[PDB]
Paper text:
We performed cryo-EM reconstructions of the Type III-A Cas10-Csm effector complex from S. epidermidis bound to an intact, cognate target RNA and identified two oligomeric states, a 276 kDa complex and a 318 kDa complex. 3.1 Å density for the well-ordered 276 kDa complex allowed construction of atomic models for the Csm2, Csm3, Csm4 and Csm5 subunits within the complex along with the crRNA and target RNA. (E) The smaller complex consists of a 37 nt crRNA, two copies of Csm2 and three copies of Csm3. An additional difference between the complexes is present: Csm2 is well ordered in the 276 kDa complex but, while present, poorly ordered in the 318 kDa complex. Csm3 mediated target RNA cleavage was inhibitied during the incubation by the presence of EDTA, which chelates divalent metal ions required for the cleavage reaction. Comparison of the 276 kDa complex to previously published Cas10-Csm complexes of the same stoichiometry determined by cryo-EM indicates that we have captured a state of Cas10-Csm poised for catalysis. Csm2 is present in two copies in the 276 kDa complex, contacting target RNA in the vicinity of positions +13 to +24. The D32 residue of the RNase loop, which has been shown to be critical for target cleavage, is visible in the structure but is not coordinating a divalent metal ion, as it is expected to, because of the EDTA treatment of our sample prior to structural analysis. The 5’ nt of crRNA, position -8, is gripped by SeCsm4 via pi-stacking with residues F40 and H291. The β3’-loop and α1 appear to work in unison gripping the crRNA in the vicinity of nucleotides +17 to +21 in the 276 kDa complex.
Author numbering:
A (entry chain H): 2 to 103, 111 to 335
B (entry chain G), E (entry chain F), F (entry chain E): 2 to 65, 74 to 214
C (entry chain D): 15 to 27, 37 to 136
D (entry chain B): 5 to 77, 91 to 303
G (entry chain C): 16 to 24, 37 to 136
RNA sequence: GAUGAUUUAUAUACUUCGGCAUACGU
RNA sequence: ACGAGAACACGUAUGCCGAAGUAUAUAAAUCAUCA
């Protein structure tokens, strides 16, 4: 039984599917007066620095650090060489919008792009999220024959004007802004892909119910605990925590949360899942969880969101509305 | 006896990945490479994979042993029947048009999709570098069909139409359930190489 | 074969190369990985000048991490990376670049072990 | 007195009765026929062959040591040179004979199967006719040798004839890759010593019979082996059609005679264009 | 009595694979190697393979029992109806050009592309290794044709031309229906090595 | 009267198979062994095979019911002709250089070519094994020509080289039509070993 | 030569898997094929580089998890792969490949 | 007020299977 | 005046048929460091 579906994902919160290309401070120029970042191609930059023999001073600009060995961005060198901005188009690849939460940019994670340097939602990522919802509903990951039938296609290419950059914000006690800026698809964007189900093993109504129950447990067990932390109240009042219970909500991409990608807070009670996940994160991350003597009100401690200053609003990283239409 | 060519071009909609050979598994580099060629190291699509996918699709469309409708078109190696495979599906070669277009646009022939697998009990993930041929890549196939029986060809091609059409509504290569290998077939000219068969009325979509 | 002794000579109870963590090593090596993929893409032994430019930009990455982190600096020093990069640019032969890539991945091979 | 040594670069087809069987030696009549035919090719004089030449059967050698046919005075076929000083007197153990039989192997008999396609040359729809040739492929540095007697001028004559012979070939199937050899002249003091012995008996070394007047007083006090010798006249001009040789019986090599006989060159041909000279001059090494 | 010599090169489009013998008991390498020479240990294309393939395609082009033209070109063993094989095929070895062309830029002589056979009940995958010569390899074919009786030779060559076409439209070797063994003939010159037959007008392509 | 030794060497251009029959008759073993020494085991070419092939080729050249040249060179033992062959083809053996070269780089003296025969009624396939000599093997030919008449050599060798020429453009051994048994002549050194005939003005190749 | 070590260790090298062994076997299979490509006993400097890369991969796979580390330590894989280069002969390399293959086959049982 | 820093780098499977294993002519 | 001479172990024959490098798999987790 072959059935094809148009699935529309509406980004209620920014989503970033990374690639491991954590590009450092020396591969972009942030215009603090334009709220824009210019991303350059390394070949063009090095060819430029060789054309007028600026590579020689580049090498001793990098090593033998100019005062602070970590704040030495791309802007400091061009300031030293007095190279103006209006001539940067010969080596800049593309420019995008930046949304801080604090001032320069620390590091810019590059989201997934194909060979044509276009933006798409991976089929594997959203299929993994949908399967996370389904396994939350049933807890059957061993079954490898069920999901051989559910085919998810890669999304269509995304226009460059629809993509921005958001700073990682970790709401633990206040609206703390982390030194991680990730390239995210902007909010209020409809992205269409295909969700084919073979042999009718999973029906649309029951997968939608699985998604809704996943988010119901997600809200009731972990999220609500942030309405008492002062930073959580500030985040919710800014619009980062909408009352979207009993609704088709998925979490996609990086920085959405440990709970948003683990069925752990679904197959167990809130308290038991809390202690077990605290033990898990204590085992994994000794940097923070190893220094916590007592279990906090939440296991992932800080909720992962971001803010946009163009509207003075906040979102949380991960929310997307999923809608199905048979064809 | 006669024999005809179906000369078409498959454009990759979502990156297509077919596993390679012994390659050179570098520590931080690609783990499962695309098969590629060797005279020019360009990506290719083996005709064996195309034939396997087409035969499986046609069988599932008909059979739900062997299926005689599938046997007539993809060989029937068994004790008693033995009929030659009507379709000699060929390997799909990286077209020169895609080469020149990707060279004139600074677009890599193949992507590199850094995938993952969360294992959602500790969310530990697994880096798993993988690549696939870039979308818009064109591979030329020269499918060869054998006219064993004169008064069957149309019927065979009817199945071929489905075996082609439902293939365009289906993936190819590895990991196709996760948006890999979605392809479309274009410029699928049909011409006769051997014999004096009339293939003008034939059409593949 | 140079990498085995240099890794075994600055590993003790732990610490590796005065603080070079695995994550920093793979951050250094991601550029080498992408250049290795490009080199395997090319069928010509002679390196295209664009690839030479990207090689000097890999050297610029190396200088940046050296000037930002000390442990990376003596990892690049005691393993004599920069002179080998210079030989790779001068030689203009793909096989030498592949040899350098194998030598570099030897570092992480012994670092894990 | 001289000894001729032969190393064969190809297998040989020394037959006995058919193309399917091949022996390891050719008796003195075959060797004499070869020498005669070669003298006829060279256009030399053949009187020394018919009146002054004594030759013996071909005997094997295993790369250093020579053999001679077993005197009839069990499983031995060729006794080495350095054992006649004890065997005739009767001091060779049966274990020694078995050991020699186990060790002695100058070559291997190969029944090579061939086809004739003459019928297919004209009748292209006909079929091949297969046959078998039994050849004897010699071990390397292993081969044949024989003892030839005569004057120095007769020996020089024979040396020239055999210089032609080594490229002429020996035995059957000479034009078909068999029988070609190369010869050398070397002296073994043992061969001379056995050639210079004396005794009441007389061991024979070349297939022989007496004249019609000497036959009676030759058989007295004798134990020997007598063989049928036949074949076909290998001659272009003997007759229009191939003619079988008149059957001739001869004393095989290794016989024992109380009183020696001079032997003869018997004309065993019919009223053909030329005679056929069956050699029966016995060489005695008692 | 002349002897025409059809000398030229055959180029591989899709990796040609003519299987070998029992080789060894290898447990994950060379699951099915290609037939190779021994003096140079180079891939070889045995003339028996060409003769058998051309025999099959010519007899199924004429007959679709032993067809007369096919019998006269290739051989007619029979109880009483044997006529000689007038076309002695020959083995194919790497050209002088290709042997150094593939070495001056480090191009492999053979491929080792992987394969599957999965299943239709459990999908057990069950892989497979096939060794095929790299595409673009040139093999020297030195076919020899005996001029038995003059006044049909041209026609016979016409027939071989047709057979050549079928080789140019079909496969040579194992797995050729799954995109393998595709070749073309080129650099073909017709000359009488021995004899006085005027084969200048003869053309093969 | 004199003798002329035509020594020299013959190089195996491609696998040469001369059947022997009684070497192996087991299941899965070689179904067609070459003729070899019983104990030495080195593959050889019998002089009878070369003699027959040369006689057949010369008869084909001359006839197109006998021509006196061939019978003079090879023998005419008929009812009314009975001649002695002027030429004595000898058995061909491995040149010691070929032996040591093959022993150095571990090149086997013989190949074990595998074949099929299939069927036009069922296409069931059927295996076959044929032993051949390794390509590039080199043998020595010691053809001795006895000069029966003086004013014939300046003709006979012209025929002989013709029989050589036809032999270097035609197979030698079994199954040569399916490419096999192709040989070439080289290193020919015509000499006069017996007599005073001038062998310095004769050519064979 | 390889049966005793495989069958001496439910218990088989603690936690070894078929996939790990075949991942190891892929590189030596490629080296075996590329050696059969060459017609000379002496291995080229390129082959030496591939052997060094094989050691690099072997050490990495030993490092990243304990199962293959114990497997390699028990089977004397590193000394034999070093001896392969030290002896520098194609036949010894083929013998090493056959030893690795026998290890894998006995692991199948 | 600045800054990112660690952890996994592919894991688990299948590793060829089924068929013909030479026939017919002297 | 060689149990010899004349005599291709030769002719026909595809290592070929069927089989997907495939199945499963979110580039993700952590939120802290320094003045």
């Amino acid at each position: 039984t072959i059935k094809n579906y148009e699935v529309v994902i509406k980004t209620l919160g920014p989503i970033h599917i990374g690639s491991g290309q954590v590009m450092k401070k020396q591969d972009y120029i942030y215009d603090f007066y334009n709220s824009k970042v210019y991303m350059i191609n390394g070949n063009k930059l090095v060819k430029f620095l060789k054309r007028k023999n600026l590579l020689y001073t580049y090498q001793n600009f990098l090593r033998y650090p100019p005062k602070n060995p970590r704040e030495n961005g791309l802007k400091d060198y061009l300031d030293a060489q007095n190279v103006k901005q209006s001539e940067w188009e010969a080596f800049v690849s593309y420019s995008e919008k930046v949304n801080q939460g604090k001032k320069p940019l620390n590091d810019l994670h590059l989201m997934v792009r194909d060979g044509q340097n276009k933006v798409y939602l991976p089929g594997s990522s959203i299929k993994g999220a949908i399967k996370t919802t389904l396994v939350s509903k049933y807890n059957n990951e061993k079954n490898k024959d069920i999901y051989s039938k559910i085919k998810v296609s890669d999304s269509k290419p995304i226009d460059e004007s629809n993509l921005a950059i958001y700073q990682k914000i970790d709401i633990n006690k206040s609206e703390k802004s982390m030194p991680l800026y990730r390239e995210c698809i902007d909010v209020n964007t409809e992205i269409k892909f295909k969700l084919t189900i073979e042999d009718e093993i999973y029906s649309i109504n029951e997968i939608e119910q699985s998604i809704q129950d996943f988010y119901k447990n997600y809200y009731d067990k972990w999220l609500v605990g942030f309405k008492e932390t002062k930073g959580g109240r500030r985040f919710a009042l800014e619009g980062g925590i909408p009352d979207v219970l009993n609704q088709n909500i998925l979490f996609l991409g990086a920085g959405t949360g440990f709970v948003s990608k683990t069925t752990h807070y679904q197959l167990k009670n809130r308290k038991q899942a809390k202690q077990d996940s605290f033990e898990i994160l204590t085992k994994k991350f000794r940097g923070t969880y190893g220094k916590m003597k007592e279990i906090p009100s939440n296991v992932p401690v800080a909720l992962k969101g971001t803010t946009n200053q163009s509207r003075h609003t906040s979102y949380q990283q991960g929310m997307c509305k999923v809608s199905f239409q048979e064809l | 006896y006669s024999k005809i060519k179906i000369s078409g071009t498959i454009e990759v909609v979502t990156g297509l990945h077919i596993g390679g050979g012994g390659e050179s598994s570098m520590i931080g580099a690609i783990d499962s490479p695309v098969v590629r060629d060797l005279q020019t190291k360009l990506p290719i699509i083996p005709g064996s994979s195309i034939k396997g996918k087409m035969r499986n699709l046609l069988a599932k469309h008909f059979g739900l042993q062997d299926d005689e409708r599938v046997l007539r078109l993809f060989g029937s190696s068994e004790k008693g029947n033995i009929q030659r495979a009507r379709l000699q599906i060929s390997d799909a070669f990286f077209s020169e048009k895609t080469k020149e277009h990707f060279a004139q646009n600074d677009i890599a022939y193949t992507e590199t999709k850094f995938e993952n697998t969360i294992n959602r009990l500790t969310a530990v993930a697994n880096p798993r570098q993988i690549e696939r041929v870039t979308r818009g890549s064109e591979f030329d196939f020269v499918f060869i069909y054998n006219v064993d029986e004169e008064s069957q060809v149309e019927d065979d091609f009817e199945n071929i139409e489905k075996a082609i059409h439902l293939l365009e509504n289906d993936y190819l290569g590895g990991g196709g359930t996760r948006g890999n290998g979605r392809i479309q077939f274009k410029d699928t000219n049909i011409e006769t190489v051997v014999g004096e068969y009339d293939s003008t009325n034939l059409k593949i979509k | 074969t140079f990498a085995h002794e240099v890794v075994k000579s600055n590993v003790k109870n732990q610490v590796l190369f005065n603080g070079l963590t695995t994550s920093k090593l793979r951050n250094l090596m991601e550029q080498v990985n992408r250049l290795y993929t490009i080199a395997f893409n090319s069928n010509e032994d002679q390196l295209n000048e664009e690839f030479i430019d990207e090689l000097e930009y890999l050297k610029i990455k190396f200088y940046y991490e050296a000037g930002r982190e000390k442990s990376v600096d003596e990892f690049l020093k005691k393993t004599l990376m920069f002179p080998i990069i210079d030989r790779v640019i001068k030689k203009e032969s793909k096989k030498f670049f592949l040899d350098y890539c194998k030598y570099f991945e030897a570092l992480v091979a012994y670092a894990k072990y | 007195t001289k000894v001729f040594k032969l190393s064969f670069k190809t297998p040989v087809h020394f037959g006995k009765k058919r193309l399917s069987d091949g022996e390891m030696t050719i008796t003195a009549d075959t060797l004499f026929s070869a020498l005669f035919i070669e003298t006829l090719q060279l256009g030399k004089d053949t009187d020394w062959l018919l009146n002054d030449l004594i030759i013996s059967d071909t005997f094997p050698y295993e790369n250093e040591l020579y053999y001679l046919p077993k005197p009839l005075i069990k499983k031995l076929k060729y006794v080495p040179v350095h054992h006649y000083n004890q065997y005739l007197n009767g001091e060779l153990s049966a274990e020694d004979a078995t050991d020699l039989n186990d060790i002695f192997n100058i070559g291997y008999f190969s029944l090579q199967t061939k086809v004739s396609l003459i019928a297919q040359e004209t009748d292209s729809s006909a079929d091949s006719e297969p046959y078998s040739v039994g050849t004897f492929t010699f071990e390397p540095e292993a081969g044949l040798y024989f003892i030839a007697k005569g004057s120095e001028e007769t020996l020089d004559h024979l040396n020239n004839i055999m210089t032609a012979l080594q490229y002429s070939g020996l035995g059957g199937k000479r034009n078909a890759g068999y029988g070609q050899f190369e010869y050398e002249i070397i002296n073994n003091q043992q061969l001379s010593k056995l050639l210079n012995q004396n005794g009441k008996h007389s061991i024979l070394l070349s297939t022989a019979m007496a004249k019609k007047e000497e036959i009676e007083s030759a058989l007295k006090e004798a134990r020997y082996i007598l063989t049928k010798r036949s074949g076909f006249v290998q001659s272009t001009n003997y007759s229009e059609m191939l003619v079988k040789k008149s059957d001739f019986y001869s004393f095989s090599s290794g016989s024992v005679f109380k009183n020696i006989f001079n032997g003869d060159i018997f004309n065993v041909g019919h009223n053909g264009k030329h005679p056929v000279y069956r050699y029966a001059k016995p060489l005695w090494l008692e």
